[PDB]
């Protein structure tokens, strides 16, 4: 599989105005899916990672923003990356987005990591754009191929035993990290349970303990839940994504949780900045924020 | 007695170095919601 050629073609369109598509061949993409799938399974479902690295929230097919992020953060392998999920749906270029991410996973498997978000699920991306994009630009068979790949993505990450990372947030069923490790891949995302929550839950300032979620799926959780969780597991910080926030990042429960969202001007419907979080060797954390020049 | 393991701690920089900004030219047709 010619990974360098795939990557070269994907990066080739940087600086284009208007933004072009990159149309890989069907077999190139199937290759990306199949080879990345093997790597996902050969690595733990709960990743254990070391700083320094850069952490990104939702992309949702905003491919040129992804290139912007890499341009400023440093293209692999110049920097290590952990993405929190939601690569596809809503945006114009889900295909270029997921392909570049899978390509980097295969090229730098020890320095580049992808978590599963709730949109890396067939029941979800059938509805929110990715299915249509595949059907329009390739075929439905390719969509199913991605699905098999997504079903093997890891679910959570812990950076140097101190930063717990996942797409959505906490679960009332989460008592031990071992429960996460025990989850078998490939798997779909169920309508309920630990896996659901990790991909779907939200922090909420006005709830005490666990509340119902307006998404109609999973739960909300409050500041005390966060405190007890960090204390119980000897962690300092929860890093999650999943909700668009105005500054690209947002603190919760003092600075015990942060929400990251990396797609600026999200799907043309929001005036949010996009942010990534840089974690240095010592776990000093800071934000690199993408916003309009105006 | 037996020495303790090295531990890292999450910290944040002084308040002027927490955020660094980079800019893009906003094209209003670049981002859409396909749904
Ligand atoms: Cl609470
Ligand atoms: Mn999302
Ligand atoms: Mn999400």
From Swiss-Prot, chain A:
GO biological process, one term: regulation of canonical Wnt signaling pathway
Listed result of changing residue 44 to R: Promotes SMP complex formation
Result after altering residue 178 to A: Promotes SMP complex formation
Activity regulation details: The phosphatase activity of the PPP1R15A-PP1 complex toward EIF2S1 is specifically inhibited by Salubrinal, a drug that protects cells from endoplasmic reticulum stress.
SUPFAM superfamilies per the UniProt record, alphabetical: Metallo-dependent phosphatases
Cofactor binding, per record: Binds 1 Fe cation per subunit.
Active site: 119
Known cofactor(s): Fe cation; Mn(2+)
Binding-site residues for Mn(2+) 1, renumbered to this chain: 58, 60, 86
CDD domains in the record: MPP_PP1_PPKL (cd07414)
Gene3D superfamilies according to UniProt: 3.60.21.10
Alphabetized Pfam families for the sequence: Metallophos, STPPase_N
GO molecular function: cadherin binding involved in cell-cell adhesion; iron ion binding; phosphatase activity; phosphoprotein phosphatase activity; protein phosphatase 1 binding; protein serine/threonine phosphatase activity; ribonucleoprotein complex binding; RNA polymerase II CTD heptapeptide repeat S5 phosphatase activity
GO cellular component: adherens junction; cytoplasm; cytosol; dendritic spine; extracellular exosome; glutamatergic synapse; glycogen granule; nucleolus
PTM field: Phosphorylated.
Catalytic activity: O-phospho-L-seryl-[protein] + H2O = L-seryl-[protein] + phosphate; O-phospho-L-threonyl-[protein] + H2O = L-threonyl-[protein] + phosphate
Keyword vocabulary terms for this entry: Acetylation, Carbohydrate metabolism, Cell cycle, Cell division, Cytoplasm, Glycogen metabolism, Host-virus interaction, Hydrolase, Manganese, Metal-binding, Nucleus, Phosphoprotein, Protein phosphatase
Modified residues (Phosphoserine): 16
Induction statement: Up-regulated in synovial fluid mononuclear cells and peripheral blood mononuclear cells from patients with rheumatoid arthritis.
EC number: 3.1.3.16
Quaternary structure annotation from Swiss-Prot or TrEMBL: PP1 comprises a catalytic subunit, PPP1CA, PPP1CB or PPP1CC, which is folded into its native form by inhibitor 2 and glycogen synthetase kinase 3, and then complexed to one or several targeting or regulatory subunits. PPP1R12A, PPP1R12B and PPP1R12C mediate binding to myosin. PPP1R3A (in skeletal muscle), PPP1R3B (in liver), PPP1R3C, PPP1R3D and PPP1R3F (in brain) mediate binding to glycogen. Interacts with PPP1R39. Interacts with BTBD10. Interacts with KCTD20. Interacts with PPP1R9A and PPP1R9B. Part of a complex containing PPP1R15B, PP1 and NCK1/2. (Microbial infection) Interacts with HHV-1 ICP34.5.
Family: Belongs to the PPP phosphatase family. PP-1 subfamily.
Protein name: Serine/threonine-protein phosphatase PP1-alpha catalytic subunit
From Swiss-Prot, chain B:
Region described as Necessary for interaction with PPP1CC: spans on this chain: 4-19
Full protein name: Serine/threonine-protein phosphatase 1 regulatory subunit 10
Signal peptide, first to last residue: none
Included range, full protein: 393 to 424 of 872
Coiled coil region boundaries: none
Taxonomic lineage: Eukaryota, Metazoa, Chordata, Craniata, Vertebrata
UniProt effect for mutating residue 12 to A: Abolishes interaction with PPP1CA and PPP1CA inhibition
Tissue distribution: Expressed in testis, brain and intestine (at protein level). Highly expressed in testis.
Known function: Substrate-recognition component of the PNUTS-PP1 protein phosphatase complex, a protein phosphatase 1 (PP1) complex that promotes RNA polymerase II transcription pause-release, allowing transcription elongation. Promoter-proximal pausing by RNA polymerase II is a transcription halt following transcription initiation but prior to elongation, which acts as a checkpoint to control that transcripts are favorably configured for transcriptional elongation.
Localization annotation: Nucleus; Chromosome
Sequence motif PP1-binding motif, location on chain: 5-34
């Amino acid at each position: 599989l010619n990974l360098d050629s795939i990557i070269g073609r994907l990066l080739e369109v940087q600086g284009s105005r208007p933004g072009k598509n990159v149309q890989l061949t069907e077999n190139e993409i199937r290759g990306l899916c199949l080879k990345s799938r093997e790597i996902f399974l050969s690595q733990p479902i709960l990743l254990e990672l070391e700083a320094p690295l850069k952490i990104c929230g939702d992309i949702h097919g905003q491919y040129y923003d992804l290139l912007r992020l890499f341009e400023y953060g440093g293209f692999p392998p110049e920097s290590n990356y952990l993405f929190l999920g939601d690569y596809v749906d809503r945006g114009k270029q889900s295909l270029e987005t997921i392909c570049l991410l899978l390509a980097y996973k295969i090229k730098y498997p020890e320095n580049f990591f992808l978590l599963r978000g709730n949109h890396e699920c067939a029941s979800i991306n059938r509805i929110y754009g990715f299915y249509d994009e595949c059907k329009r630009r390739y075929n439905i068979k390719l969509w199913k191929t991605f699905t098999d790949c997504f079903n093997c993505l890891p679910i959570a990450a812990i950076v140097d035993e101190k930063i717990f990372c996942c797409h959505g947030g906490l679960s009332p069923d989460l008592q031990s990290m071992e429960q996460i490790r025990r989850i078998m891949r490939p798997t779909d995302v169920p309508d309920q349970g630990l896996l659901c929550d990790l991909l779907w839950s939200d922090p909420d300032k006005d709830v005490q303990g666990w509340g119902e979620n307006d998404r109609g799926v999973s739960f909300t959780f409050g500041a005390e839940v966060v405190a007890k969780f960090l204390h119980k597991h000897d962690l300092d910080l929860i890093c999650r994504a999943h909700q668009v926030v105005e500054d690209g990042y947002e603190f919760f429960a003092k600075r015990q949780l942060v929400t990251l969202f990396s797609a600026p001007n999200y799907c043309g419907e929001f005036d949010n900045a996009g942010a990534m979080m840089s974690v240095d060797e010592t776990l000093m954390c800071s934000f690199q924020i993408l916003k309009p020049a105006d | 007695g037996a020495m303790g393991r090295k531990r890292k701690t999450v910290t944040w920089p002084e308040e002027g170095k927490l955020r660094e900004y980079f800019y893009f030219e906003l094209d209003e047709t670049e981002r859409v919601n396909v749904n």
